[PDB]
Design a protein around this ligand. Structure first.
Ligand SMILES: [Zn+2]
Ligand SMILES: [Zn+2]
Ligand SMILES: [Zn+2]
Ligand SMILES: [Zn+2]
Ligand SMILES: [Zn+2]
Lengths: 365, 365, 365, 365, 365
């Protein structure tokens, strides 16, 4: 088999990156179609447009309705065509960025993504999560190409609610364990082959960076301020975790996250918070040693990530609900079959319940 | 002298093992005489019979009265003869399994033992503990042959009361210390010679597995569920501890257990719980270092095993009762004379009292 | 998803074990059919018969023609039937012992094997290598049952040519690496399921024992004498390696050994010598680190095992011959498909040639 | 300079040693003059006499008035002469044993000392502490010869009040630090020269034994019972500490002990308890590292030895009283001048006050 | 079950110790009977007499005939009686010192031993090796009492042939291994009981001192000069090894030494040289790890001690001669039965031959 790794063409990160990226963007296209929701358009949109203008780039800004749907994509494409813009910029959260990727794909245009929050590792991926207009999940669009640019303005990201950065560390904490499980399993990644050592090494660096820098970063983020620990964690959360999942692989943790979406009590939790618990379930599943379980429990408690079912809103009917979560986890096509051993709905149910009891004892010690 | 190790022919372990063992059983005999108490016959008996039938094996199931006595053996043998069954299956607890071994021995038939609980290391041994009909101990029957098969259905074992699995870890915790004491003493085992390195290595693996996996297993067992930590502990409790005691040796811990049976206050405690304290007494007896005493104390407290006389129901008249326990420990034929130094009833009394004080201080720290 | 481990009922080892095993044999049967070639019958046959007689066991000794063939089995069975003997004893090398196993299987009788040489790990297995009368390989007979007894007289084994004990260490050196490769691959063993920790632990102990004791044992064996290092190595070579391969698994090393039997220049080499080189090829195949390659190279050179193609008699036409060896290694049903990654005839050819170059450089340093 | 080490001829230790030492005593003399106070004469005197009689040794037992004075020595000598006894046995505490040494010295007779308590390291020394009849210290008599026998019956010693054994560990804890300070200083010992490595090594073993065995011993002593930890601590307290101080050297700790005898508030404390604090003062004096101070503080707190002035009864007028203790410590002839650096009454005052503050903080943490 | 340690009253060591010991000797007796051979009487006798005279001690010097025989003892006693001397001094080698001990024993007098060579650990022991007038071994006289003084003049010892100091290190190298083997075996020592930790600790210090200081000392001894490495080795060779063997125990090494005295080819070797090889045989016998065998081989080669039979003069008829040496080693009453396992003449033969092969390979590497 071939080893494959993919990457966005360029990844930029630092103070004022949203006003400094024009130099590199100029070489991608002579004009850009910029999208954002109204909140983000007023916060960072006006600065981005002024900066792109200062490098002699023609722009048309347009409002995003808040959902990454096929209808919304086609509506914005129609406006893009009318103006004849040669690139696409997305500014804001996950749904905005994913819509910018789709527009770039269908129009064969270069894509710039400018996350204003560091809460997922989606920004670097050649992936969009497609929703209906009502907000229910529909499908995944996997693209041949990653975004041409990823721009992380850490002055803007620092001022976002601390909870979002913590959810980002929860999403990133899973990367080493799922990557390493795919590596041991010889499981294919989204890149299309086995893992390179490069991708797996960055998966591991992600994890060591969270342990080294996670707490120093969270406190800087709490204050609303930019330190080099936050810079390291933003890179961990975005570039290291992003290359890690796409080119090394997903496994149990993210399958269990998808299993938990069937319970409405978990809908108040962010993507990465559920993944943090799912990682803990994966550790019990692959029988990681106790001091490894304790470092992850210790990390999660310290930063504010859920280590028990109760912290995820599941308080009643546990046996039946976890059985249902376990079945949906092991559904055909799910990433849990990338584990290097046999997984059954019984053994995922087992892992989730034991993980919960490990987290209860830990919080009560 | 010769080095000797003995083993059951085959040891099977996993989910649904009680319905999957027919493939291997078919080669031992064309028909089987299956025994169990009424509780166990309804819980796991009907599945075992259906599974054996599916591999074309003729069966007659018969009720076990609950005591491993000579009278009960002879009653069941008489029924076995009437049906002409070519093998014996025991399903259930210690007394049921030991009766199946005796029947197999006296009739020269192959034996299958199917423990539904993982609370002792007896299942693999060529040993039966014989009782009177009233329930008083009578003698030990040591056989030339181990059971031909040992089948551990971990889905059934997981659902047993957690206390039984913990008592099993208490019985297993003694194996390394008594094995190693017989090895140092050059003391003969039940196998009939000195210890092989194989048997001693498995004795040590038993101990390291308890420390590594014991807590993760207990919580899975608490939830009623099967994890790979429980699988490791069930193997530790059954195969590793079983080969360990029979082919490496018993020593102080089990002699002290036998010493404690003279006190009626200890009759509510299970075999392995008393052995856990007896192991602690052996550590003080052989003067193991403090951090070794602390790892065992720490293990016992954490899982729920007695580290003090009070936790074993001995609250009054301590000096006189421990003196009597000390005398009965050093009785002729007891395994404490396998220690690599001189033991007297005074020095066992000493060890028990000091161990108690070590456990009090530990629980109060 | 069952874990399985199998074992011979009893394994005996020490000085004069061939004259002391009657105590345990008496409980298996009241009479024994003893087989050996003429060389072995005069060396150790007369002592074995006198010892069995001293424990009141009836015997008939019969001559073995030197080949483990279906014809030879049926000839000896016919004589066994005429005398009405209730057990089978084999004394001597691999072909004698394997014929005793077959006789025991087809007649449903207990089996005692008494290896006079410690050159393979076959003695404990439920396996016979069947040959034609001319000496060409025909098939494998895998039995449900292991030998009931394995008796290792280390006074007799010590006096055998040193080369045979060294070939035994070469066969045993492969056990950890193939076991561990099956464990990582989740590959089924001859026992019939996944590996227990017991079997894998003994596989590892085999390897550590060779490194610790291998040189001290070889020199004792050179002198013709019994030390406790030789006792440890005889156990490593027989019990530890035997449980290791049968219940943990075979993989690349033994498949490559089978690949080399197509070259007539290798026919002068013993089983375990070819396995030692095959293990080296497996290390390059699974990309073990250099320090691990160097410990194995260092061990092999020191004891006298081949680390280069030239030491195995392959001097000319290397590219074509190794290509043919590589194809036969990857034949359907071979144990190389138990590796935890994709193996092709190209990558086995690659590994063998690189291993050869590693061994040349090592010998010339 | 010469290196010198001295020792008692024989040191005996174990259960029932006071009734088993007759075999060795028989070779020293054909008759013995035995002394003890009335309490000790009834407790252990009658057994000792019966045991000496059983090895055919003539005896006269005589009462000791309780003080090691010149008057008492001369009174007992006069009675010894009247009976014509050829040896001397002392049974009991320090003052009894020291009087037996003096009698042996002045009469040129062999000496046996039988400590019934393990609270000082005096028993092995060629030293007697001479008092007036009223109980005030008078002088030291240093002898050319050590006791010919030292007999430690650990069954009798175990039953003594726990506080005495703890005071013995306090006296012994000083041995390594004062020995090592004399070794570094090249200071002469009572043996008469520099330290041998033997004596210094035993000084160090004393210290490591207290840390390893001190707590296990104290609890056995609390219960009134004999374990091998108590045996190790009795040897540490008596033989290891005894050879340590006499043949390696005393230094600051014991000088400070002598300094504290000027304060009447300290008269309720035993010799070794004051030495334990004096050792702590020596650590601050020689500027031992913090983790060394913490291991000694930790040891002292755990066993029950004073780490503060208040625990020694000094609660008021601290500055003036410690100044007076500091002057008396640095008096001409004191062992503090064996330190490897300049000591002044100011720097001993300093050390004592800082040590006190280290002990307060430690107890309050 | 008593622990016993014995010692000489005082041990002196340093430059000019033979002229400085009078201070301590004066307190033992008012006059001394001094013995030495003519060589030693002229070398160091005249200085010793002048020094004893300077402390006002009356002396009569008398010539020693060179053999420690009953006849020689009785001849010198008769002269001692005529002069009425109150003590005994021996100056010179082993036979002189042992005769001084016997004279002191039979006359009930104090003993001073002044070894002019550091080649054995006999000087401190309560032991004399008795010979016939012709020089054949007769018996051992074990005394109740050790020498009252042991005086080591390191200026005199330094000038002795280097070979003698090296033989002393060979005798001392065995002490830890035989002591530790008696400790593990719970074997009684010459002191009369089990080992104290003191005696075993000094046994170990002996061994660590040889490895640390042995080479630096040998070169100083080669030059004829006194360094502190030589002082450490003289103490190791005399005090540490002496307390080690007498109060901890002898085992295989010294039994094998006694076994080798039956071969006339070994009569040119000194006591300790044969013990060095015997220690190597003990390592193979107890199966010490390879790295430990290599440190001892490395030490022996470096200093000049035999590691092969050929270096001990055994070149021909090896099998038969080593068999005879093996039988005489295992004779009833020999110290090899203090090993913690079964020893047979076959397994000592085995160990000696394998040790030889280990030493050949080592010298040829
Ligand atoms: Zn994610
Ligand atoms: Zn048990
Ligand atoms: Zn093989
Ligand atoms: Zn003191
Ligand atoms: Zn010696």
């Amino acid at each position: 088999m071939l080893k494959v790794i993919q990457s966005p063409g360029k990844y930029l990160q630092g103070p004022d990156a949203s006003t400094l990226f024009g130099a590199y963007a100029k070489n991608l296209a002579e004009s850009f179609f910029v999208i954002a929701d109204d909140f983000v358009m007023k916060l960072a949109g006006d600065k981005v447009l002024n900066g792109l203008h200062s490098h002699d780039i023609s722009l048309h800004a347009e409002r995003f309705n808040g959902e990454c749907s096929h209808v919304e994509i086609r509506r914005l494409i129609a406006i893009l065509k009318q103006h004849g813009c040669r690139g696409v910029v997305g500014v804001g959260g996950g749904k905005t960025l994913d819509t910018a990727k789709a527009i770039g794909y269908y129009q064969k245009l270069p894509v710039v993504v400018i996350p204003t929050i560091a809460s997922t590792d989606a920004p670097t991926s050649a992936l969009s999560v497609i929703y209906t207009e009502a907000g229910e999940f529909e499908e995944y669009l996997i693209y041949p190409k990653n975004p041409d640019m990823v721009v992380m303005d850490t002055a803007i990201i620092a001022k976002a609610p601390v909870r979002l950065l913590v959810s980002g560390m929860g999403d990133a904490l899973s990367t080493w364990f799922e990557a390493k499980a795919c590596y041991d399993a010889r499981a294919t990644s989204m890149a299309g082959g086995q893992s390179t050592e490069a991708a797996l090494s960055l998966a591991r660096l992600c994890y060591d960076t969270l342990l080294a820098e996670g707490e120093k970063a969270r406190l800087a983020a709490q204050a609303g301020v930019v330190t080099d620990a936050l810079e390291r964690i933003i890179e961990a959360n975005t570039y290291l975790s992003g290359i890690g999942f796409e080119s090394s692989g997903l496994a149990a943790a993210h399958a269990i996250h998808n299993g938990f979406t069937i319970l409405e009590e978990c809908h108040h939790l962010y993507h990465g918070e559920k993944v943090a618990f799912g990682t803990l379930a994966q550790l019990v599943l692959q029988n990681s040693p106790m001091e490894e379980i304790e470092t992850v429990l210790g990390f999660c408690e310290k930063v504010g990530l859920p280590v028990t079912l109760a912290q995820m809103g599941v308080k009643e009917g546990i046996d039946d609900k976890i059985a249902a979560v376990a079945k949906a986890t092991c559904a055909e096509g799910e990433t849990i079959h990338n584990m290097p051993f046999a997984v059954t709905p019984e053994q995922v149910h087992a892992a989730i319940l034991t993980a919960d009891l490990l987290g209860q004892q830990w919080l009560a010690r």
